[PDB]
Each structure stands twice: as structure tokens, then as C-alpha cells.
Design a protein around this ligand. Structure first.
Ligand SMILES: *[C@@H]1O[C@H](CO)[C@@H](O[C@@H]2O[C@H](CO)[C@@H](O[C@@H]3O[C@H](CO[C@H]4O[C@H](CO)[C@@H](O)[C@H](O)[C@@H]4O)[C@@H](O)[C@H](O[C@H]4O[C@H](CO)[C@@H](O)[C@H](O)[C@@H]4O)[C@@H]3O)[C@H](O)[C@H]2NC(C)=O)[C@H](O)[C@H]1NC(C)=O
Ligand SMILES: *[C@@H]1O[C@H](CO)[C@@H](O[C@@H]2O[C@H](CO)[C@@H](O[C@@H]3O[C@H](CO)[C@@H](O)[C@H](O)[C@@H]3O)[C@H](O)[C@H]2NC(C)=O)[C@H](O)[C@H]1NC(C)=O
Ligand SMILES: *[C@@H]1O[C@H](CO)[C@@H](O[C@@H]2O[C@H](CO)[C@@H](O[C@@H]3O[C@H](CO)[C@@H](O)[C@H](O)[C@@H]3O)[C@H](O)[C@H]2NC(C)=O)[C@H](O)[C@H]1NC(C)=O
Ligand SMILES: *[C@@H]1O[C@H](CO)[C@@H](O[C@@H]2O[C@H](CO)[C@@H](O)[C@H](O)[C@H]2NC(C)=O)[C@H](O)[C@H]1NC(C)=O
Ligand SMILES: *[C@@H]1O[C@H](CO)[C@@H](O[C@@H]2O[C@H](CO)[C@@H](O)[C@H](O)[C@H]2NC(C)=O)[C@H](O)[C@H]1NC(C)=O
Ligand SMILES: *[C@@H]1O[C@H](CO)[C@@H](O)[C@H](O)[C@H]1NC(C)=O
Ligand SMILES: *[C@@H]1O[C@H](CO)[C@@H](O)[C@H](O)[C@H]1NC(C)=O
Ligand SMILES: *[C@H]1O[C@H](CO)[C@H](O)[C@H](O)[C@H]1NC(C)=O
Ligand SMILES: [Ca+2]
Ligand SMILES: [Ca+2]
Ligand SMILES: [Ca+2]
Ligand SMILES: [Ca+2]
Ligand SMILES: [Ca+2]
Ligand SMILES: [Ca+2]
Ligand SMILES: [Ca+2]
Ligand SMILES: [Ca+2]
Ligand SMILES: [Ca+2]
Ligand SMILES: [Ca+2]
Lengths: 141, 70, 71, 142, 142, 70
């Protein structure tokens, strides 16, 4: 039965919510604008680093802003009109090189194409490529 | 499948206990491709939340290592 | 013994005078006469009259208790 | 397996058959302990019968259908019980139009009692203290 | 009972087949005037059928007298809710337990589709390899 | 085409259109024709036709609750 007139946000040094405030039956509580965190003092707001805290908000390299974030794209990718998705630009389409027992296989990234690079190896447990010399390396365990 | 900053901070989980046995994985654009020993499969999904999971192939032998050549 | 509660039989000691089936009337407050499966139920002013009517291939007992098949 | 109704004291003595004729498929019976009668049902003749306890003086006391529409008919009659306090016979049926019928103990005043949410009413009984009817359904499982 | 005093099952009466050897059961005069016993629908052909066979989809009377489409297509012949299963193409309503029983009940295999999804009873059922449910009393019965 | 209980194929423009198109009334049955209103169930107030406004808006001289229902 204390402060039952609700109103408790309606002053400066008392309550001292630095963004916005709402009052219960008895008393105030503080609130922030979108993209700000209520800090542990319960009075005050801070910018989250949305790039570090939630990287899934950008398809690629992210840039922090006080109160928001902006999604950039790495060199060689174009930013889609949706403002989030980055798309690879070079007409060279990718494919998956993966190794099995007895085989090294060249699979297209949608499952439509599935071919054979090499066969009759012992046991290929590791594999990697070289862009500069168009080479391929592997371990026959 | 988990990812984190290069210093091992701010870990986030893509798949949470849904994977039998990953052994190798690679990411291109927004997609992650991994090799599963137990199902003997290569399969892919979104690299941030794991939505749109698709089995690309039923290998007869274990697929060990995988790379995206680009 | 409680799974068949004890109560006063309306046909008690007389079958209500009916020579045949003394049945309990609906509501369980009175009785009612009847006749077997092959008798004709005929009502007089104060007494029911059931008499045999069994087929040619049925045999009627000397004291008219019932009818049985000829075989 | 023998199409008979027997009787025997509870000390295993004096076993005796009381009915052996014109009994096609007797589905269930109950004993009127009050006026001393045996009531039974049969699935082929689709009827409700009555006898003296010793087997003499058989009669049929319900046939054809229940209700004024012929909506509910003897088709596969099954469990039977008596409420001789009020002179009623209750019986279940699990035909297409499965239901629970009721009639006076002398064949008047037949009625349906349960006609909804009932598919396979095998069992029926009365709690004689509460005067509550009970049944079970083998399909809906209640 | 027939003319020549041999009596036959009531279902065979006016069944288009001479049974009483005197053609009394297929006499047009009797097959017209006679009334079907309580609970059975009567065809114009004179045949008697259980009332459950009206709107059966399948022909019963031979003249399609048992399938008035206009009547069968209204609300008056809906399925018994939460006790019966409705077909997907035809207007037949089948008993629910006939779903997934190894027989074409709905006449369009609707009752036997998607049988791998229906869950068997948690206590009193045995699950077959073809995803059917049987009473547990039938396992190892021979 | 929504399949009526009696086997009629009716376009989805007619489901719960307050008209018996199927001939049996299956299309307009209450299973689809309930459409429950906003219950406003937890941690707020409720005024008129389901305005789930916060409790501070109770009788606060601000006519936001339909036609000032509070
Ligand atoms: C499969 O793919 C491989 C690799 O892509 C091909 O191998 C390449 O073949 C080309 C020729 O078609 C080679 O080119 C030649 O390389 C010589 C050596 O270069 C080495 O040294 C230089 C300098 O340090 C490095 O930059 C280079 O990476 C090498 O390490 C050059 O001397 C040759 O130049 C001579 O000929 C040309 C004309 O062809 C003249 O213009 C020059 O003046 C000079 O006379 C030449 O460029 C290349 O080296 C091979 N790859 C590599 C990286 O080694 C296979 O041919 C291909 N197989 C098939 C059948 O398609
Ligand atoms: C949460 O906090 C913000 C910031 O305090 C509140 O924003 C306020 O919004 C009003 C209306 O949009 C602003 O007034 C308007 O300002 C513009 C000039 O920017 C003027 O042209 C308009 O005529 C109008 O006056 C107000 O300035 C702004 N607050 C401040 C102090 O900047 C917001 O309303 C709060 N939300 C809640 C739910 O409390
Ligand atoms: C069904 O099983 C029950 C329980 O096993 C049987 O009850 C038993 O009935 C006999 C006969 O009345 C009892 O024996 C008698 O006991 C009395 C009292 O002690 C005694 O005076 C008699 O001389 C005789 O010994 C027995 O004790 C009793 N047991 C129990 C636990 O109730 C019942 O008879 C069985 N019914 C049938 C139809 O088989
Ligand atoms: C017994 O039959 C009569 C018809 O002779 C039924 O009365 C009709 O019932 C339907 C709904 O079931 C109504 O749409 C009709 O308008 C009724 N017609 C008349 C003339 O009243 C009656 O409902 C049936 N009884 C039971 C208990 O089902
Ligand atoms: C005959 O059956 C009818 C029901 O079909 C009985 O009527 C009910 O009787 C009880 C008890 O008297 C009343 O509480 C109900 O309100 C009655 N319902 C209806 C719909 O009638 C009637 O009692 C029976 N008659 C006899 C002789 O017992
Ligand atoms: C993989 O194998 C399963 C059977 O185990 C088969 O149903 C499926 O179609 C296969 N995958 C592809 C891409 O066809
Ligand atoms: C009909 O069945 C549904 C379940 O399918 C049930 O919720 C409902 O209460 C039943 N009653 C009617 C006639 O709507
Ligand atoms: C048919 O109905 C009539 C009444 O119109 C008679 O009750 C007749 O006995 C019924 N038919 C049979 C087979 O009994
Ligand atoms: Ca920020
Ligand atoms: Ca029968
Ligand atoms: Ca039924
Ligand atoms: Ca069952
Ligand atoms: Ca015939
Ligand atoms: Ca039919
Ligand atoms: Ca079936
Ligand atoms: Ca078996
Ligand atoms: Ca409609
Ligand atoms: Ca208000």
C-alpha cells in the first residue's frame, strides 16, 4: 500500500531512467530504446555490440554503431537489396572436394552433380588445395 | 556445431545435440557443409541457425575430409 | 449377499394366482401374469386364461404344462 | 460350445442342465433373485427371454426394435442386469446403432437409455447402493 | 414362411432367388405389398436391407433404390462424429476400427492410406511390421 | 478445393462463407468457424473488443480503449 498513485517515473533525479520509464501500481521501472541493454544499476542504458553479441544478424563482416549495427560484405561479394545477405560475385561457381576411403570426389554444392577426381587410393583421411598453382594435396594414411 | 570469435569468446551454437558424428566442415557464403560418419553422409545447412538442412549424398564409405574449392 | 439386496417378492407364496409366469410389473410395485412362448393370452374379467396353441409338429403335455417338439 | 445353461450349488454338487432346447447363441444372462426367474439374451433370434429358475415356462418379452422410430434394434445384444427394486431389465447392444436399452420385467415400456458416444458396450452393471448405472466400451475404451 | 410350408430366413425373402421351390418368395404380388420388419429399409424392388446400408455407396437393392444421392448428400446422413471415419472421395461413413485393418472399407483405399502414422494402443496392442495394430491376445496364438 | 465430408470439391473461397455450398453444411461447421477473439491473457489489462493495453491505461483519461470502454 506504498506509492499507490502509480506515478513514479515523473521526475528527474528520483527514478533517473536515462531513456524511458513505466510505473507499476506502486513504483517505477526503467526501459531502453531498441538495441540498448538495461545495465546492472537498473537506472541506465548501454549500446550492445550487436556484431560481437549476435553475429547472425549479418551474413558477413559487421560494423557496430551506437544504438544499431550495419552489415557490410567482404571484398568479392555484393550486398543483396534485403540489406543483409551477401552474394558471391565471381562467375567461378564453387564445388565441394571431399575424400573417402579409396576415393576423392568433386560434388556440386546443390547435390545436382557428383563426380570422381581420383580412385584407387589407400585411405585419404586429409585433403587440401592450392589456389596459386591449381594443385591438390592429401594424406594416404 | 559451434562458432566463436578467434579469441574463443562469445560462443554460439548452430546445431544443439542434433548431429550424430561430424568429422570435417567447411563454410562458403552463408552455408556450412559437414561430413557425418554415423549416417555416412555429406550434408549442409545455414551457417548461423542450421535451417534448411539437406543430405547431399549417401556415401558407401566414411567421408573424412571436405573443402570448398573457390 | 449384499450384491443381491433383500426385498419383498410381489408374487409371494401365490404367484398372484397366475397358473403361469408371475412377472414383476414395471416400476416394481405390482405383479402381472403371462403365458409361455406358444400359448394364447386370453383375459377374463378377473383371471388370465392361457391355453396351448402349439403346432402340428409340437406335442402338448397331458396336464398342459408346455409344448415340446414332436421328435 | 454346447448351447446349454447349467446350474450347480456353490459346494460343487448337484450339477444339472436346465435349458438345452431352442437356444441358438445365448450372449448373457442374469438371475432375478426376487420373483425367481432367469433372463437371457440371444444374438441370432435377437430377443430377450424369461424362464422359471428350473427352466420351465419360457417366454420372449422383447423383440424387433426399441423406440418409436425403429432407430435402435436388437442386432448384437450382449450384457444384461436387473434392477428388481424398480422392476427393470437393462441390456447393452453393440450393433451398428450400438446402445443401452431398458424394459419393464414383464416386457412393457421399452426405451433407449444411452445412444451417444457408444460403439462397443460389452459390459453393463448397476451399483445397487447409489442406483448408478455403469457400462464399459471396448472400442472407445472408457 | 412360404406357400409350401417350408420356412426360410427372413433375409432371403424377395432376394431375386427362388428358395421355397414354389416361387412364393419371388412372387411379385407378395414382393410388392410386404413391409420390411422394424429396423430394415425397404427397396422398391421389394428387398429388405438393414437401415445402415442406406447411403452405403455400394448398391444393395440392385436397382440403386438404396442410394438416393440427393438425400445422401445432405447433412441428414453425416458420419457419427468421434466414432466413425469419413472417406476422402466417396460419401461413405465407415466404423472407425475398420481403419488400417487390411481391407478396403472406404472403397477407395482411404481407410488404408498412411497406415504407418496411426499409433497402436500403449498397453494392449502389438505392432506389426506393416504398421498394423492387433490385439495382444492374438500374438503367438498360432 | 476443400473436400466436403460428402465428397464435394469446393474452392477455398467458400469455406466458412456463411453459406452451405457443400449441401451438408460441412464447409461452415464450427471447427473452422469459431475464430476466437483476443483473450489478452497474461501481464496486461483488457478493454472492449480485446485491446490488450498495459494496466497504466486503466481509466487514465486517454480514450484508447475502443469508445472509452473504461
Ligand atoms: C594442368 O594445369 C597445370 C597448372 O595450371 C598446367 O601446368 C601449367 O602449364 C603452363 C603452360 O601451359 C606453364 O606455363 C609455363 O611455365 C613455365 C615455368 O614457369 C615457372 O616459373 C615461373 C617464374 O618463376 C613461375 O611464375 C611459374 O609459376 C612456374 O613456377 C614458364 O617458363 C613458361 O613460359 C614460357 O612459355 C611462354 C609461352 O607459353 C612464354 O610466354 C614465356 O616467355 C616462356 O618462354 C610457361 O608460362 C605453367 O608453369 C604450368 N603450371 C604451373 C603453375 O607450374 C598444365 O599444363 C595443365 N595440364 C593440362 C594438360 O592442361
Ligand atoms: C522512448 O524514448 C524516446 C526518446 O525519449 C521517445 O521519443 C519521443 O517521441 C516524440 C514523438 O515522436 C518526440 O517528439 C517529436 O519530436 C520531433 C523532433 O524530433 C518533433 O518534430 C515532433 O513534433 C515531436 O515533438 C520526442 O522528441 C521524443 N523524445 C525525445 C525527448 O527526444 C519515445 O516516445 C519513448 N517511447 C515510449 C514508449 O515511452
Ligand atoms: C472361494 O474362495 C473363498 C476363499 O478361499 C472361500 O471361502 C472359504 O469358504 C469356506 C466355506 O465356508 C470356509 O471354511 C469354513 O470356515 C468357517 C469359518 O471358519 C467354518 O465354520 C467352517 O467349518 C469352514 O471351515 C473358509 O474359511 C473360507 N475362506 C475364506 C478365506 O473366506 C469360498 O468358499 C470359495 N467359494 C467357492 C464357491 O469355492
Ligand atoms: C423420429 O422420426 C421423426 C420423423 O417422423 C423425427 O422428427 C424429425 O426429426 C428431424 C431431426 O432429427 C427434423 O429435421 C424433422 O423436421 C422432424 N420431423 C417432424 C415431423 O417432426 C424424430 O426426430 C425422430 N425421433 C428421434 C428421437 O430421433
Ligand atoms: C417408461 O419409460 C420412460 C422413459 O422412456 C420413463 O419415463 C421416465 O421416468 C422417470 C422415472 O419415473 C422420470 O424421472 C423421467 O422424467 C421420465 N422420462 C421420460 C422421457 O419419460 C417411464 O417412467 C417408464 N414407465 C414406467 C412404467 O416405468
Ligand atoms: C539416400 O538413401 C536413402 C535410403 O537410405 C534414400 O531414400 C534417399 O533417396 C537417398 N538420398 C538421395 C539424395 O537420393
Ligand atoms: C465432434 O468431434 C470433435 C473431435 O473431432 C470434438 O471436438 C467435438 O466435441 C465433437 N462434437 C461435435 C458434434 O462437434
Ligand atoms: C410391415 O409393416 C406392417 C404395418 O404396415 C406390418 O406390421 C407387418 O407385419 C410388417 N412386416 C413384417 C415382416 O412383419
Ligand atoms: Ca551498436
Ligand atoms: Ca444378430
Ligand atoms: Ca455405430
Ligand atoms: Ca480395442
Ligand atoms: Ca428368396
Ligand atoms: Ca447401398
Ligand atoms: Ca480398412
Ligand atoms: Ca497370431
Ligand atoms: Ca461455404
Ligand atoms: Ca483507456
Amino acid at each position: 500500500e506504498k506509492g499507490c498513485g502509480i506515478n513514479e517515473c515523473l521526475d528527474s533525479s528520483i527514478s533517473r531512467c536515462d531513456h524511458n520509464c513505466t510505473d507499476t501500481i506502486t513504483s517505477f521501472y526503467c526501459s531502453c530504446l531498441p538495441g540498448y541493454k538495461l545495465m546492472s544499476d537498473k537506472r541506465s542504458c548501454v549500446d550492445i555490440d550487436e556484431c560481437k553479441e549476435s553475429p547472425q544478424l549479418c551474413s558477413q563482416k559487421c560494423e557496430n554503431v551506437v544504438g544499431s549495427y550495419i552489415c557490410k560484405c567482404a571484398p568479392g561479394y555484393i550486398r543483396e537489396p534485403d540489406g543483409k545477405s551477401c552474394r558471391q560475385n565471381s562467375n567461378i561457381e564453387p564445388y565441394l572436394i571431399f575424400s573417402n576411403r579409396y576415393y576423392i570426389r568433386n560434388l556440386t554444392t546443390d547435390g545436382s552433380s557428383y563426380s570422381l577426381i581420383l580412385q584407387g587410393l589407400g585411405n585419404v583421411v586429409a585433403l587440401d588445395f592450392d589456389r596459386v598453382e591449381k594443385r591438390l594435396y592429401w594424406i594416404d594414411a | 556445431i559451434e562458432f566463436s570469435d578467434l579469441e574463443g569468446h562469445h560462443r554460439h551454437t548452430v546445431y544443439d545435440g542434433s548431429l550424430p558424428h561430424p568429422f570435417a566442415l567447411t563454410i562458403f557464403e552463408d552455408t556450412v557443409f559437414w561430413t557425418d560418419w554415423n549416417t555416412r553422409t555429406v550434408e549442409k545447412g545455414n551457417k548461423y541457425d542450421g535451417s534448411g538442412r539437406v543430405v547431399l549424398v549417401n556415401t558407401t564409405h566414411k567421408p573424412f575430409d571436405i573443402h570448398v574449392y573457390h | 449377499p449384499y450384491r443381491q439386496p433383500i426385498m419383498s417378492n410381489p408374487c409371494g407364496t401365490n404367484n398372484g394366482g397366475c397358473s403361469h409366469l408371475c412377472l414383476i410389473k414395471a416400476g416394481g410395485r405390482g405383479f402381472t401374469c403371462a403365458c409361455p412362448d406358444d400359448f394364447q393370452t386370453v383375459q377374463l374379467r378377473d383371471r388370465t386364461l392361457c391355453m396351448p396353441m402349439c403346432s402340428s409338429t409340437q406335442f402338448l403335455c397331458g396336464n398342459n404344462e408346455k409344448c415340446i417338439p414332436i421328435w | 460350445e454346447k448351447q446349454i445353461i447349467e446350474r450347480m450349488f456353490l459346494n460343487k454338487t448337484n450339477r444339472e442342465t436346465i435349458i438345452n432346447h431352442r437356444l441358438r447363441r445365448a450372449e448373457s444372462l442374469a438371475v432375478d433373485w426376487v420373483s425367481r426367474k432367469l433372463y437371457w439374451l440371444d444374438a441370432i433370434l435377437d430377443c430377450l427371454f424369461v424362464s422359471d429358475l428350473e427352466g420351465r415356462h419360457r417366454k420372449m418379452i422383447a423383440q424387433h426394435c426399441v423406440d418409436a422410430n425403429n432407430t435402435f434394434c436388437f442386432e448384437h445384444p450382449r450384457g444384461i442386469v436387473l434392477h428388481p427394486q424398480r422392476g427393470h431389465v437393462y441390456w447393452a447392444d453393440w450393433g451398428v446403432h450400438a446402445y443401452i436399452g431398458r424394459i419393464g420385467m414383464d416386457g412393457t415400456n421399452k426405451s433407449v437409455i444411452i445412444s451417444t458416444k457408444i460403439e462397443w458396450p460389452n459390459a453393463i452393471t448397476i451399483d445397487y447402493t447409489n442406483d448408478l448405472l455403469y457400462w464399459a466400451d471396448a472400442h472407445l475404451g472408457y | 414362411q412360404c406357400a409350401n410350408k417350408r420356412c426360410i430366413p427372413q433375409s432371403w425373402q424377395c432376394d431375386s432367388v427362388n428358395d421355397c421351390l414354389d416361387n412364393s418368395d419371388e412372387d411379385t404380388s407378395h414382393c410388392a405389398s410386404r413391409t420390411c420388419r422394424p429396423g430394415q429399409f425397404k427397396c422398391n424392388n421389394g428387398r429388405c436391407i438393414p437401415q445402415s446400408w442406406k447411403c452405403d455407396v455400394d448398391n444393395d437393392c440392385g436397382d440403386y433404390s438404396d442410394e438416393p444421392i440427393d438425400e445422401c448428400t445432405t447433412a441428414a446422413y453425416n458420419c457419427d462424429n468421434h466414432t466413425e471415419f469419413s472417406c476422402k472421395t466417396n460419401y461413405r461413413c465407415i466404423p472407425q476400427w475398420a481403419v488400417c485393418n487390411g481391407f478396403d472399407d472406404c472403397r477407395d483405399n482411404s481407410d488404408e492410406q498412411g497406415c504407418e502414422s496411426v499409433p497402436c494402443h500403449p498397453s494392449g496392442d502389438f505392432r506389426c511390421a506393416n504398421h498394423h495394430c492387433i490385439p495382444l491376445r492374438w500374438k503367438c496364438d498360432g | 478445393q476443400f473436400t466436403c465430408q460428402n465428397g464435394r470439391c469446393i474452392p477455398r473461397f467458400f469455406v466458412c462463407d456463411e453459406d452451405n455450398d457443400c449441401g451438408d453444411g460441412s464447409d461452415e461447421q464450427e471447427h473452422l468457424c469459431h475464430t476466437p477473439e483476443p483473450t489478452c491473457p497474461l501481464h496486461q489489462f483488457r478493454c472492449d473488443n480485446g485491446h490488450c493495453i498495459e494496466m497504466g491505461r486503466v481509466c487514465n483519461h486517454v480514450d484508447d480503449c475502443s469508445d472509452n470502454s473504461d
